[PDB]
Design a protein around this ligand. Sequence first.
Ligand SMILES: Nc1ncnc2c1ncn2[C@@H]1O[C@H](COP(=O)(O)OP(=O)(O)O)[C@@H](O)[C@H]1O
Ligand SMILES: Nc1ncnc2c1ncn2[C@@H]1O[C@H](COP(=O)(O)OP(=O)(O)O)[C@@H](O)[C@H]1O
Ligand code: BEF
Ligand code: BEF
Ligand SMILES: [Co+2]
Ligand SMILES: [Co+2]
Ligand SMILES: [Co+2]
Ligand SMILES: [Co+2]
Ligand SMILES: [Mg+2]
Ligand SMILES: [Mg+2]
Lengths: 594, 609
Amino acid sequence: TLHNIITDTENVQGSFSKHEFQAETKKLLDIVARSLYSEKEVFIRELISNGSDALEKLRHRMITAGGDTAPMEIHLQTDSVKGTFTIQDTGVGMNKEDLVSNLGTIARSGSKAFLDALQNQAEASSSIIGQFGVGFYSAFMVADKVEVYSQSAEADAPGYKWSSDGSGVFEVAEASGVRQGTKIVLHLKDDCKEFSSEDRVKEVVTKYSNFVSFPIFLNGRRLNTLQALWMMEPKDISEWQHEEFYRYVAQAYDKPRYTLHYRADAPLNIRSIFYVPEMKPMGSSVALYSRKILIQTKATDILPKWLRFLRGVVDSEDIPLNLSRELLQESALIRKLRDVLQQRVIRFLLDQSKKDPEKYARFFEDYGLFMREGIVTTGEQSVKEDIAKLLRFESSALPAGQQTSLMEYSSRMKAGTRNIYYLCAPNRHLAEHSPYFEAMKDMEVLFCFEQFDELTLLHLREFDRKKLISAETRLSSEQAEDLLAWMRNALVQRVTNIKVTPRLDTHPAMITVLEMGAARHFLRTQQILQPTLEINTGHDLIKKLHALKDSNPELAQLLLEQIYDNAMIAAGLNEDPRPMISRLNQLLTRALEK
Amino acid sequence: TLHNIITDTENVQGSFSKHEFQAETKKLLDIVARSLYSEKEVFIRELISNGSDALEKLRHRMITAGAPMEIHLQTDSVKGTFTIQDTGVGMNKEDLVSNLGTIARSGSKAFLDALQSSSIIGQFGVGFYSAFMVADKVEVYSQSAEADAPGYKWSSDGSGVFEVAEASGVRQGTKIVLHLKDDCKEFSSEDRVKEVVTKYSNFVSFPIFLNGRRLNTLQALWMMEPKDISEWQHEEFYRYVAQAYDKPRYTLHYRADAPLNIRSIFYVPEMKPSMFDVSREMSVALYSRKILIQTKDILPKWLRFLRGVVDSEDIPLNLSRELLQESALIRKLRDVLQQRVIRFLLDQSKKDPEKYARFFEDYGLFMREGIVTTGEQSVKEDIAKLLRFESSALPAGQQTSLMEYSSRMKAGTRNIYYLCAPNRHLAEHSPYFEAMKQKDMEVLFCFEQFDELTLLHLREFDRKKLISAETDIVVDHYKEEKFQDSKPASERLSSEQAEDLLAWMRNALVQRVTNIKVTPRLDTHPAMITVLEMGAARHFLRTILQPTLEINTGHDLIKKLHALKDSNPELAQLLLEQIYDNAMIAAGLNEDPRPMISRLNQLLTRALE
Ligand SMILES: Nc1ncnc2c1ncn2[C@@H]1O[C@H](COP(=O)(O)OP(=O)(O)O)[C@@H](O)[C@H]1O
Ligand SMILES: Nc1ncnc2c1ncn2[C@@H]1O[C@H](COP(=O)(O)OP(=O)(O)O)[C@@H](O)[C@H]1O
Ligand code: BEF
Ligand code: BEF
Ligand SMILES: [Co+2]
Ligand SMILES: [Co+2]
Ligand SMILES: [Co+2]
Ligand SMILES: [Co+2]
Ligand SMILES: [Mg+2]
Ligand SMILES: [Mg+2]
């Protein structure tokens, strides 16, 4: 039933003309200045990056030719009456030939050419931002008209004025008195007048360009420029610099409880700092930077989903950037970086689990849901068991409240079998009285009390080739029976079985449950599943129950309901006993007729 | 105090040269191949889109006059090739050279302006070069219509040059062959190519065949007349967009042209949301024309339970066609959609209150979230309109709303009273309600566990302050409002017995309570705990509050306690401690009830003599 028409029918029956690829220049300018960025404000990022590059070239140049004590800075000026945005740097500037070439030609980058001639380990090779040759045209996004004044440091080269409206043509004339470097004046479109507002410019500068290495001034005022902590030696960073940097980078008001300052060079250059907040659960995630400039507020491809609880920053200088500079290209190197980072963070958290198990215990209670989620969603067994190292549970051999890893269980496994038995229960009381538990008379059972603990072990399957397997695979003798047959008569629509058990002392009764899909079904029903009473015939209230049933057919009932309800609370199946209170008050009142 | 260097000093000297912008073609080609599109797979979308446009041009050419218009895909694993062929209008030599041999030239842009339909996808003039993301050799065979035009083979590397020759066996339309480079062999996999078609091109308006088999392309339901869509078509479309197996309980098919173009459909699943899926964070797809535009940002966070699709011609596309421009435009779209969805949900409650009750039970958590996290009062109140409660002024819910409470308001009153309790019975016989019954105000009864928090965050509704019954009871102490006891003095403890009892209680509960007082406001309850900010206290207890213990000297239990302090004094202290615990539990201020059990059993044994 196939329908295909693709057929090898074509033969070239002629000569062979040869052409070169062309570019429609007019249209290309329109694209860059329109359908490139997601946001207009981004022209500021571009112009400042260009200023930085210009200064950085000048700094490189004065390593050999120096040295002027000329100051290296970027100035921004707003004029809200003329509707202009102006940016000036005191960098290397441009002569006439470099204005025509660099500005007049789309995709032509002088910074790229400058980078390509550097010794591969000169400092400028890491700090230069531009290489596409298009960012300057982002000015036409917001400006009807653009004027560039430029003075190069040269053979007393004259100053020059470049001007364009962005519609295919530009003018260049000689000028004075242009200061060494480059001044760019944007005559803003009516719809872009907001970029002649001081407060708005300031918002853009701090958003993208807050860690630019040269001083930024706006209307003669120094902006609050921060240090890119991630670029520095981890032992030149104090704990209290990390605290301030974290709050800034995470938009937080607490302190990091964990800090991982990670640096390396393969598969990519990476300078990064991760934080775990102290507070139990823009800057809602880890930010991506390249050469100290924001690429994405919320980095998408560099970390796994389950690690989204980390705050902080990743900076790579050779990460392949998309032309918009707000996305990353598809790369085997980005993929490897995510793998590398996943292991690095896992490794870091293990180490912390040893240094301070108590602090790690606190960490796990708060953020353990993410490990659980990670184990479930990632369909690769090798890493499921890498995330699983971070999990904690209680045990059938260890005291209540005390945590163990799978490792501390897998170690204590006898040479006999190679499979791990868990019992996922709402709490300790119910675990210790599971019939399935008592099957394990002698084997140790992991007690998994946390939400989705059952789900992860299901999705886990195996750990260290060991298998995860749910472990769910006085008063005479007729006085009791009479009382029993009587208790079954009032709890008809509630419990199923009323046993009698010789293992009670202070408690008159207790509730047990067989299968715990239903126990974890009740709750969360409230916003009736097979419970079982067990009676202590030695207890006074039970002995007081047996008698009163015939001496009081209106008061006893209260004593029965109460004993039942008290047992349900004791089992952790009723933590909001609001419904019993008024009744209990009736019981106490009727009891206290003395 | 200022440091500036920007001064108006620059003056033009002499004349000026005029210049035309230029372009560096080879680096441009490279930018398109390596830096333009985030994902390599997208060349399938770009080539299919070009095929769709060519078929529209031909369809429009063949309307003045009297072949099956289709797009064929073929994968050769052995040869490492990806092939696409459309039966479209084709290209002549001058077309191949000017349109394909020129970056940013768009024949599809010039065809449009020569109509003075809206089905043409291509405007940038660059989509075709996406092939060089995945291919180190591209051949193009094209036959124009009619036009007494010969066939042509276009071929490139593509770096700088391309050849153009005459070919003989060219079918009407265009065939393109990609010799896949080696890190891109996945695109000679049928299963892989198919994933991309259905991802980006699943609504193109011509049949697409892959290796001889027709792909299940769909109608763009959202662009069509709401009345022409059956319930069953919505069932199927829902399953596709939400990737689900159940059906929608509600369907909102929304169009609008002012203030912005909008073509959308939204669904609420019949299945309850997974609480795991709710906690973790993973929505709605965004489209232009009929091609998927990568994004999901469009709805406020509280409306993430919705599934379906949004299309708006007012969202312009970035060059890569995966990002959308105008971020404030989006906030407006988001505001419009939020407002429209609230209206829809309100109409659903009116139309079918039983069905809405099920919806509110399953999804209400989202509305409470939306109210708590929004900062705008009017948005919080808009969402609050969706909330449902019961009332003291109506039998068993019988679900009412804040608006309906407002309309029953008196002249008159400047407050909306509520009481949060876990069910209807407990509210009705709450000691806090017995106290409010002495007033003639209506009380909302709220049963969900996060209702309190929600109303605390809401604060007011339609300029009316929300006050919990518990709070109001405390404020009344400082208003010197007067109330009569529900029983006469004959069956209450005398004044002297009251204070005598109180001074004993204060001694027996020293660091546990601030005040202990008599209250004339209870009937069936012996006591209650009061705390001005009761709601905030309850919320704070999630892992001492200056509580007041108020007693009812008419209650037999309290009166009995008075007797016990001089009869069995030890028993009186155990009783007292139990009443306090009882009042704490009933106030919802207890911590963990288990350490009280053994204590309560000790109390029962002593009383049962
Ligand atoms: N402020 C400036 N000072 C000196 N030269 C500049 C300045 N801005 C731009 N240039 C030159 O113009 C070229 C093009 O700028 P741009 O369009 O941003 O491309 P790139 O990606 O190379 O930065 C730069 O490579 C640089 O040579
Ligand atoms: N399959 C095709 N059939 C006919 N013409 C085509 C085809 N593919 C491309 N073209 C022509 O080449 C031009 C450039 O295509 P493309 O690079 O996608 O830019 P755009 O599609 O945005 O115009 C198109 O405008 C169209 O005129
Ligand atoms: F600033 Be360039 F275009 F990368
Ligand atoms: F297909 Be075009 F590049 F919009
Ligand atoms: Co041949
Ligand atoms: Co080199
Ligand atoms: Co002037
Ligand atoms: Co009225
Ligand atoms: Mg640049
Ligand atoms: Mg196209």
